[PDB]
Design a protein around this ligand. Structure first.
Ligand code: CLA
Ligand code: CLA
Ligand code: CLA
Ligand code: CLA
Ligand code: CLA
Ligand code: CLA
Ligand code: CLA
Ligand code: LMG
Ligand code: LHG
Ligand code: BCR
Ligand code: PQN
Ligand code: SF4
Lengths: 80, 41, 73, 742, 160, 63, 142, 87
């Protein structure tokens, strides 16, 4: 549904994963930062699109980026 | 006065003291020189 | 309106409303019409008068011609 | 266990904490970095729960803030008595009040505003006041302006005492948490000591001061030759010539011969035909009764003397089969959360202020209150707006209790847990009754507008068309008029004149009150009122119930109260917060209270307020057009919003032209609100970025970065200008129209 | 000029003086002649008569409404309507703009530059509010020396 | 790598808030493979409220 | 990492009933089951609205959304020291285990997971939309 | 309450107010309704004659109506109201 993209400006601060309320983001190993980890979005079909990860990203400009695309019953947040 | 004058130098107090002086001046201009539509000088 | 463009209100179209009472039928009858009509405030009478259209048959022929033009398009 | 817990000198009285502005919050103590720091400085200024997690210092902050509020109200009362003493015509109005308008504000002759000092009468120029202070001082027995100056300087003394107590109960001896948690003692000393002894003391004033002076004012005696209030206490024969029951001298009180006090303690009812205001023998019996009843009710709870009630024992014994473990933990709610008690107290104070508004147009308590129509409209309108604001704030602090003080571990299977457990049912059935009320009142208005537009006056909801007579109200008004004969014997007359007992009271040639008719128009506008109150309840109760979580956002309590949104996800989570429900309930309070005061103004300008000529003919201000024009929106726009606005727009060049200026400036503040309400932060942030670029070009960049207002702040600014502009529009239109035709 | 009669010879402007005193004289009829509110209306009448004798003596132009109209084109007769108080204004408005600009330069080279804007340093402020008197000689002096404007390489610019 | 620690640099990154702004370098990572090693501290915060950001040496010049 | 199997014999927390629970999306589309092991009998805030007494052993809670499982799960990870996992249950009977996928929570890094949805460029090096007209690819997915 | 043997009983698929009674009428009443409502069964057939039959039945009484039945077919019954400026 929603497309969440991680860019190489990430410092591995992990707070995009901690702010995620639908378990989209996970921290995979990486070689481009001091923390040696970058975020990724394997369960991007579960993304509501709330951009809590973009609110918690301290990198200017943002490393996690959520693009609101086709919206399904996962990304609409319904219970009915 | 190391901190009382610091409070008196804050943004709302200095706006109140300046605009109190500013509106105090412009009212007193408008008493002795009222209805001023054209500057004669 | 072509006979007297100063004292005749230009009529747009007739009104067929099932919700009118008799005051609404008697009050919307303007311009010397047989029923309740809408007064045209679009300036189409002034336009068609200045351009050369005089009778209702000329306006009907123009309506058929522009039906044909829209059909061609 | 109830006793005084204070401790000495918690914080030192120093100005070094005045110099640092954001000392209360950890985020604002680092100093400013953007221009949003200034707005969070004011937003978190009074929010004492966000400062510290210790409820003891929070309660001390709230207690000294109460004392500062009391100091501000005593400064305000000092000003209004000093304005009566020096800048009023209160002695001139008190000589004859049927021709001289009440005025207590003189403007300075500076810029052409000296035309606002209008001819109010009595050889006086000033702003005609509508606050009702003149009739209040006439009911208090105030005869001279020296008494007003003495009350002003006494109020200044009490304002200094409240400032001293606010300093004392935060910096010298501040109470501890268990002192504030003695709610049984606080209720015992508020019911008996505050509302009981206050009613008893005002009853003593209304026995010795208000009653004989106001009896002499009904006799046409000049107030300069009326004896002073202490002369009735000293010379009791002077008090006995007006009431012979004073000749016995306190022996019927202790021998239970209270009927011998029937000369000055009566259950008359109705209005004084001399003045148009309630009797003070009834207002003194009223205060003596609510004092001998609030002092009884103040001996109910258990403090430390054995007798009484633990209210936890009252609550925990109140449990039912439809609830199970209900009412348990609500004592722990209402003694550990300031916001829950604030919600209950604000709901009662707002609803009570609405009670005050109705029980003052209908039973006018002050002499020449009813016949001064400006005072009646302004007092009703002011108390409706205060009451609506306080009930919206009640729902606000209910929601703040949910997001910041509701502990789910202590509340299992009680009333609050089960109300949260079926909040979908509450909000959905409230939604149904709101939509049903909206169609069955406003669509009835739309139907009347449509058939009046289509030339079908018989197809409407009129008194001549399909009738919708309020048979329950028309029966309860007959039940309240035909009461003295059988269900309430000992009454000389009836409770109010608006019930149907006759008594066309004419004071000064102007109608005080008469029987108020209730027809199809009153039915329609009362269903509008019920609809608007229900919708305000719907947004506000939805914000209270969905403050913790929702089906949309299950972690909404972690986001807080003043958060804008979660984001553009789940379709968009804009205005999910409980704050945003308070924000929308402020608009629905505008809608509700504005239609309430519009129905009030038109209903009594059409059916109550007017003049009486010879041979008993009553000519109202807008004669009889409420029954036929207030059933359509075109009548409300035409015979109310256009016909009665023909004195706010042509008041220019007169004393009421400031009402025209504030009418137009109130339209300005309303259209200014629509800038903040309809727009959003990011547009203004990029426009400010262009302005910051222009400042960078000319080296006038501030180090405090210019930022757009926050989304919560932009909505707050928009609703503040919407309420301020619309309320000031109605204030200007009301206070120009009813002053002009009054 | 522009079809407007002068206000000293305008019959409509003298009509508005006649109907303004007559409104105030009828307000005076219901007061005692030595009373305190009658002294305010008597001071209002003398304020009105001073106003109408000031507008006619300045060469103001009155239209068909009897109202003084301002000619802002830059006429040699009409300098005090727009040009003379405009130059008086822009001197005062440039004084506000120069002492606020010079305050920000003086606090940008400080230890905490953001605490000097919420808490304005009055000895630093008042020593340059006097210096804003001679500001056209200091604004064009900074314009000619290049210190007024900042080069675009050191200015924060949003991307395309 | 990096220009210098404790030096004044100007950001050439287009999408940063501090583009064409004076910043102070506080840390340069000398580990290979790091894309943005130079840590630059700024006197002014961005809209997120932070002043610490990592840039490559290609996006900075000494000023 | 072997995913845990849903036992379907552990019991529910003591809850009086809520109207915020499973609607017809549970019946035809999906519903979410969260299973966690408890130290003792506690009281927790229900993400549908309300409070329930959680059991002294393993607990099973049926939820409608994936966000309700994280809102509950982060509540009993910070207030309580309880490890949790949840599932996705479909109406045909298939139970899809969802979190944590490697057995360790996604805040902590694991060597088994791979980078997906990761761009080696930044935002400023994304291509303009004018040079990607009429293509399935967009400015960020390449 | 999860079972893995009955997926409908653990998800809310309950006939909350349903009944399993086979019949409660008699054969005489049942044969009358299916005979009369036998040409109204098919959705594609019923949508055809309801649109075509519904368009005719509003055009019939729209046209055969009288002056007292509907005011729009009554027409004006008084002198027309002349507007301002002689129009
Ligand atoms: C930018 C708009 C603007 C401009 C050009 C002026 C300028 C003027 N107004 Mg002003 N005025 C304005 C906005 C404006 N006004 C607004 C917003 C208000 C409402 C608060 C007023 C209400 C006002 C008052 C009440 C008075 C002035 C007066 C004056 C004069 C000031 C003379 C002096 O020494 O002091 C001058 C002609 C005074 C005057 O001489 O009137 C001509 C005077 O009576 N004005
Ligand atoms: C002059 C005597 C004095 C001094 C030096 C102090 C010292 C202190 N007070 Mg205060 N206090 C005093 C009198 C004093 N107080 C009184 C009279 C009250 C009763 C209101 C209290 C109650 C009190 C509370 C409850 C709190 C303190 C605290 C504070 C600290 C700084 C707060 C601050 O910034 O104040 C500056 C504040 C102001 C200038 C605002 C004053 C507002 C007044 C009441 C007027 C408001 C209405 C006014 C008419 C404006 C209306 C709007 C207008 C546009 C019309 C500091 C230790 C705080 C503290 O220690 O916590 C960290 C705290 O929370 N004080
Ligand atoms: C019989 C004693 C008594 C009485 C008269 C009151 C009266 C009052 N209380 Mg108090 N209170 C008492 C005992 C009493 N209290 C007890 C025992 C408790 C402890 C459990 C509390 C704790 C409590 C708190 C925490 C607060 C109050 C507040 C209030 C005020 C109500 C708000 C208001 O605007 O009212 C109308 C206000 C007035 C009429 C002003 C009257 C002020 C004068 C000086 C009397 C007050 C002094 C004292 C209480 C009684 C002295 C009597 C004296 C006249 C001889 C009012 C001053 C509230 C407040 O505003 O805080 C300041 C507040 O929330 N009370
Ligand atoms: C708190 C209110 C209050 C207070 C302070 C007073 C004060 C007074 N009353 Mg009382 N009185 C009150 C309530 C009050 N009364 C009420 C509500 C009633 C109705 C029962 C009266 C009716 C009353 C009578 C009938 C008389 C007094 C009298 C007295 C005086 C002597 C008793 C005394 O001081 O003790 C004193 C001036 C006596 C007096 O001297 O009259 C002035 C007197 O004869 N009182
Ligand atoms: C008994 C009265 C009472 C109590 C104790 C409080 C107490 C509080 N309120 Mg409030 N509330 C109430 C009633 C009250 N309120 C009412 C009347 C409303 C409806 C408007 C609400 C709605 C409510 C909401 C929506 C929220 C609170 C919150 C707050 C908290 C701090 C707000 C702050 O720092 O002030 C800030 C003060 C200002 C910004 C001053 C602005 C004043 C108004 C808005 C504009 C000016 C109006 C003025 C009359 C017009 C003059 C114009 C002229 C100057 C040109 C505090 C707990 C906030 C919170 O976080 O609670 C924890 C918040 O989010 N309140
Ligand atoms: C005149 C303007 C207007 C109108 C028409 C509406 C209409 C509605 N508002 Mg309101 N409201 C408005 C302005 C308006 N609002 C603004 C200013 C705000 C922003 C603050 C709000 C925000 C809002 C809130 C936040 C809430 C409402 C809700 C509602 C509903 C109330 C129930 C009702 O009356 O149903 C009857 C419907 C009508 C009277 C609309 C006219 C329909 C006519 C009568 C039917 C005939 C037409 C015909 C079928 C055409 C063919 C209704 C749909 C409430 C809601 O949805 O729950 C009940 C709700 O909670 N309002
Ligand atoms: C310190 C003084 C200072 C200086 C020299 C200027 C000068 C500049 N500003 Mg301004 N401005 C300032 C204060 C200052 N401003 C402040 C305090 C604010 C907030 C109200 C703004 C808000 C602002 C806006 C909204 C706009 C400008 C713009 C402008 C330009 C034209 C002047 C103008 O539009 O009228 C002045 C505009 C105002 C809104 C009046 C604010 C001036 C206040 C009263 C001065 C306060 C100074 C004092 C020391 C504190 C110019 C580059 C425009 C631009 O982008 O450049 C072309 C523009 O769009 N400014
Ligand atoms: C009566 C109203 C004045 C009350 C002042 C009380 C008070 O703050 O002063 C009591 C203050 C307490 O002194 C405080 O001491 C602190 C260090 O501990 C800091 O220096 C504070 O600036 C200083 O206010 O005593 C003073 O030194 C008086 C000067 C400040 C009062 C100025 C009044 C204007
Ligand atoms: C107003 C009256 C509405 C009747 C309500 C009334 O009579 O309440 C009766 C019932 C009382 O329940 P219990 O017997 O559990 O109450 C014991 C009380 O002490 C509550 O603790 O209240 C409810 O269950 C609420 C039902 C509201 C139903 C929707 C009404 C809206
Ligand atoms: C000064 C100045 C100025 C001016 C200003 C202007 C421009 C104006 C605007 C304004 C407008 C254009 C409007 C406004 C309006 C107002 C208002 C509106 C206000 C109000 C206030 C208040 C305070 C209120 C009160 C109230 C209330 C609260 C409630 C009830 C009612 C009332 C009313 C009583 C300028 C800038 C030039 C310059 C500088 C200075
Ligand atoms: C206009 C507007 C702004 C911009 C509003 C701003 C920047 C507030 C302006 C406040 C004053 C005018 C600036 C600060 C004034 C200083 C005290 C300096 C004094 C200068 C003069 C006022 C004397 C928003 O931020 C916004 C956010 C969300 C929805 C709508 C809107 C919105 O409509
Ligand atoms: S929050 Fe931003 S910087 Fe931190 S790990 Fe996530 S993407 Fe990287």
């Amino acid at each position: 549904a929603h497309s969440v993209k991680i860019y190489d400006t990430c410092i591995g601060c992990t707070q995009c994963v901690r702010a995620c309320p639908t378990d989209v983001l996970e921290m995979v190993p990486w070689d481009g930062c001091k923390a040696s980890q970058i975020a990724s979005a394997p369960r991007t079909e579960d993304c509501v699109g709330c951009k809590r990860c973009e609110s918690a990203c301290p990198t200017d400009f943002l490393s996690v980026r959520v693009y609101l695309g086709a919206e399904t019953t996962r990304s609409m947040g319904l219970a009915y | 006065m190391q901190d009382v004058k610091t409070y008196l130098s804050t943004a709302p107090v200095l706006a109140t003291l300046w605009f109190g002086f500013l509106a105090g001046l412009l009212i007193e201009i408008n008493r002795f020189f009222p209805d001023a539509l054209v500057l004669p000088l | 309106w072509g006979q007297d463009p100063l004292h005749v209100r230009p009529i747009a179209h007739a009104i067929w409303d099932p919700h009118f009472g008799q005051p609404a039928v008697e009050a919307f009858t303007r311009g010397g019409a047989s029923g309740p009509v809408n007064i045209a405030y679009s300036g189409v009478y002034q336009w068609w008068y200045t351009i050369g259209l005089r009778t209702n048959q000329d306006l009907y022929g123009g309506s058929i011609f522009l039906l044909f033009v829209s059909a061609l398009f | 266990e109830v006793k005084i817990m204070v401790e000495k000198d918690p914080v030192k009285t120093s100005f070094e904490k005045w110099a640092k502005p954001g000392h209360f919050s950890r985020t604002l103590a680092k100093g400013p970095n953007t221009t949003t720091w200034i707005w969070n400085l004011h937003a978190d200024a009074h929010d004492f729960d966000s400062h510290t997690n210790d409820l003891e210092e929070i309660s001390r902050k709230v207690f000294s803030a109460h004392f500062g509020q009391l100091a501000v109200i005593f400064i305000w009362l000092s000003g209004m008595y000093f304005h009566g003493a020096r800048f009023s015509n209160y002695e001139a109005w008190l000589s004859d009040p049927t021709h001289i308008k009440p005025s207590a504000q003189v403007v300075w002759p500076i810029v052409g505003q000296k035309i606002l000092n209008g001819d109010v009468g009595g050889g006086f120029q000033g702003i005609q006041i509508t606050s009702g202070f003149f009739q209040l001082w006439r009911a208090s027995g105030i005869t001279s302006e020296l008494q007003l100056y003495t009350t002003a300087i006494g109020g200044l003394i009490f304002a200094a005492l409240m400032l001293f107590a606010g300093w004392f109960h935060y910096h010298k001896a501040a109470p501890k948490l268990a002192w504030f948690q003695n709610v049984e003692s606080m209720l015992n000393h508020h019911l008996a000591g505050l509302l009981g002894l206050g009613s008893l003391a005002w009853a003593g004033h209304q026995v010795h001061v208000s009653l004989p002076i106001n009896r002499l004012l009904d006799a046409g005696v000049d107030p300069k030759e009326i004896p002073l209030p202490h002369e009735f206490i000293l010379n009791r024969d002077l008090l006995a010539q007006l009431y012979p029951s004073f000749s016995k001298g306190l022996t019927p009180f202790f021998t239970l011969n209270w009927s011998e006090y029937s000369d000055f303690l009566t259950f008359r009812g109705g209005l004084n035909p001399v003045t148009g205001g309630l009797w003070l023998t009834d207002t003194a019996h009223h205060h003596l009764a609510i004092a001998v009843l609030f002092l009884v009710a103040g001996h109910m709870y258990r403090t430390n003397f054995g007798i009484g009630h633990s209210m936890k024992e009252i609550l925990e014994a109140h449990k039912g089969p439809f609830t199970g473990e209900g009412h348990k933990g609500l004592y722990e709610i209402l003694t550990t959360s300031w916001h829950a008690q604030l919600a209950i107290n604000l709901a009662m104070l707002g609803s009570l202020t609405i009670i005050v508004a109705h029980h003052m147009y209908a039973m006018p308590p002050y002499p020449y209150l009813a016949t001064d129509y400006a005072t009646q409209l302004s007092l009703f309108t002011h108390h409706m707006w205060i009451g609506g604001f306080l009930v919206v704030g009640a729902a606000a602090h209910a929601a703040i209790f949910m997001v910041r003080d509701y502990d789910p571990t202590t509340q299992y299977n009680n009333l609050l847990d089960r109300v949260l457990r079926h909040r979908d049912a509450i909000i959905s059935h409230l939604n149904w009754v709101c939509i049903f009320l909206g169609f069955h009142s406003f669509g009835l208005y739309i139907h009347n507008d449509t058939m009046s537009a289509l030339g079908r006056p018989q197809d409407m909801f009129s008194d001549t068309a399909i009738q919708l007579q309020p048979v329950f109200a028309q029966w309860i008004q007959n039940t309240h008029a035909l009461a003295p004969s059988l269900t309430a014997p000992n009454a000389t007359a009836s409770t109010s004149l608006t019930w149907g007992g006759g008594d066309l009271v004419a004071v000064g040639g102007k109608v005080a009150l008469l029987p108020i008719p209730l027809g199809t128009a009153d039915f329609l506008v009362h269903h509008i009122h019920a609809f608007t109150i229900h919708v305000t309840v719907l947004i506000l109760l939805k914000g209270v119930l969905f403050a913790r979580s929702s089906r949309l956002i299950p972690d909404k309590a972690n986001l807080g109260f003043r958060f804008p949104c979660d984001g553009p996800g789940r379709g968009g989570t804009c205005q999910v917060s409980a704050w945003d429900h308070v924000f929308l309930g402020l608009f629905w309070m505008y809608n509700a209270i504005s239609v309430v005061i519009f129905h009030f103004s038109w209903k009594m300008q059409s059916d109550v307020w007017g003049s009486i000529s010879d041979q008993g003919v009553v000519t109202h201000i807008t004669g009889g057009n409420f029954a036929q024009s207030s059933i359509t929106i075109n009548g409300w726009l035409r015979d109310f919003l256009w016909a009665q606005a023909s004195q706010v727009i042509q008041s220019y060049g007169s004393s009421l032209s400031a009402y025209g200026l504030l009418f137009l400036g109130a339209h300005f503040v309303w259209a200014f609100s629509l800038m903040f309400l309809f727009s959003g932060r990011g547009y203004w942030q990029e426009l400010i970025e262009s302005i910051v670029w222009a400042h960078n070009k000319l080296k006038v960049a501030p180090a405090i970065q210019p930022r757009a207002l926050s989304i919560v702040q932009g909505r707050a600014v928009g609703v503040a200008h919407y309420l301020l502009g619309g309320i000031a529009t109605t204030w200007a239109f009301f206070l120009a129209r009813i002053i002009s035709v009054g | 000029v522009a079809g407007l009669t002068p206000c000293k010879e305008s019959k409509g402007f003298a009509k508005r003086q006649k109907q303004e005193i007559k409104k105030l004289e009828g307000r005076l009829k219901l007061y005692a002649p030595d009373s305190a509110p009658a002294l305010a209306i008597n001071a209002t009448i003398e304020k009105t008569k001073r106003r109408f004798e000031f507008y006619g003596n300045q060469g103001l132009l009155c239209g068909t409404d009897g109202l003084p109209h301002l000619i802002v084109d830059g006429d040699q007769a009409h300098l005090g309507e727009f040009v003379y108080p405009g130059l008086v204004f822009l001197y005062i408005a440039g004084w506000i703009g120069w002492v606020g600009r010079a305050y920000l330069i003086d606090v940008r080279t400080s230890k905490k530059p953001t605490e000097k804007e919420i808490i304005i340093d009055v000895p630093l402020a008042l020593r340059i509010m006097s210096k804003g008197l001679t500001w056209p000689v200091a604004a064009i002096g900074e314009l000619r020396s290049g210190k007024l404007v900042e080069k675009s390489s050191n200015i924060t610019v949003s991307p395309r | 790598i990096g220009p210098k620690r404790g030096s004044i640099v100007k950001v050439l990154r287009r999408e940063s808030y501090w583009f064409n702004d004076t910043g102070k370098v506080v840390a340069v990572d000398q580990a290979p493979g790091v894309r943005y090693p130079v840590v630059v501290r700024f006197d002014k915060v961005n809209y997120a409220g932070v002043s610490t950001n990592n840039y490559s040496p290609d996006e900075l010049e000494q000023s | 990492f072997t995913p845990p199997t849903l036992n379907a014999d552990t019991p529910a927390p003591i809850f009086g009933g809520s109207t915020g629970g499973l609607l017809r999306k549970a019946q035809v589309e999906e519903f979410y089951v969260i299973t966690w092991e408890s130290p003792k009998e506690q009281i927790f805030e229900m993400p549908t609205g309300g409070a329930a007494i959680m059991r002294s052993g393993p607990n099973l809670l049926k939820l409608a959304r994936k966000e309700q499982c994280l809102a509950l799960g982060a509540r009993l990870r910070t207030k309580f020291k309880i490890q949790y996992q949840f599932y996705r249950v479909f109406p045909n009977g298939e139970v899809q285990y969802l979190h944590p996928k490697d057995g360790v929570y996604p805040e902590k890094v694991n060597a088994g997971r791979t980078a997906v949805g990761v761009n080696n460029r930044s935002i400023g090096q994304n291509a303009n939309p004018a040079e990607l007209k009429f293509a399935h690819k967009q400015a960020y997915d390449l | 309450y999860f079972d893995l043997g009955e997926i409908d009983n653990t998800t809310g698929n309950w006939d909350l107010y349903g009944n399993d009674d086979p019949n409660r009428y008699n054969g005489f009443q049942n044969k009358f309704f299916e005979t009369f409502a036998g040409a109204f069964t098919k959705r594609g057939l019923l949508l055809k004659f309801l649109v075509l039959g519904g368009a005719t039945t509003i055009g019939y009484l729209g046209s055969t109506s009288s002056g007292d039945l509907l005011a729009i077919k009554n027409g004006p019954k008084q002198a027309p109201i002349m507007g301002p400026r002689g129009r």
